[PDB]
């Protein structure tokens, strides 16, 4: 959803 | 949704 | 939705 | 929707 790279 | 690269 | 590269 | 490159 917030940040990361793939998904979230 | 916010940030990241793919999806979110 | 906001930022990222693909989708979101 | 806002920013990114493809979609969003």
Q: How would you sum up this structure, described in words?
A:
- Chain A is mostly loops.
- Helices cover 0% and strands 0% of the residues of chain A.
- Chain A has no helices and no strands.
- The N and C termini of chain A lie close together (4 Å).
- Chains in contact: A-B, B-C, C-D.
- At the C-D interface, loops of C face loops of D.
- The PDB classes it as protein fibril.
- Keywords: enantiopure crystal grown from a racemic mixture of cyclic peptide, protein fibril.
Protein traits:
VVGGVVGG-cyclic; tetrameric; homotetramer; 8 residues; little secondary structure; protein fibril; enantiopure crystal grown from a racemic mixture of cyclic peptide
Looking at how many chains there are and whether they match, the oligomeric state comes to homotetramer
Q: How many angstroms does the end-to-end distance of chain A come to?
A: 4 Å
Total beta strands of chain A: 0
- Which protein chains are joined by the largest interface, and how many residues does each one contribute? A-B, 8 and 8 residues
List the helices and strands and how they pair.
The structure is a homotetramer of 8-residue chains.
Chain A: no helix or strand
Question: What is this structure, in a nutshell?
Answer:
The structure is a homotetramer of 8-residue chains. By secondary structure, chain A is mostly loops.
């Amino acid at each position: 959803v917030v940040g990361g790279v793939v998904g979230g």
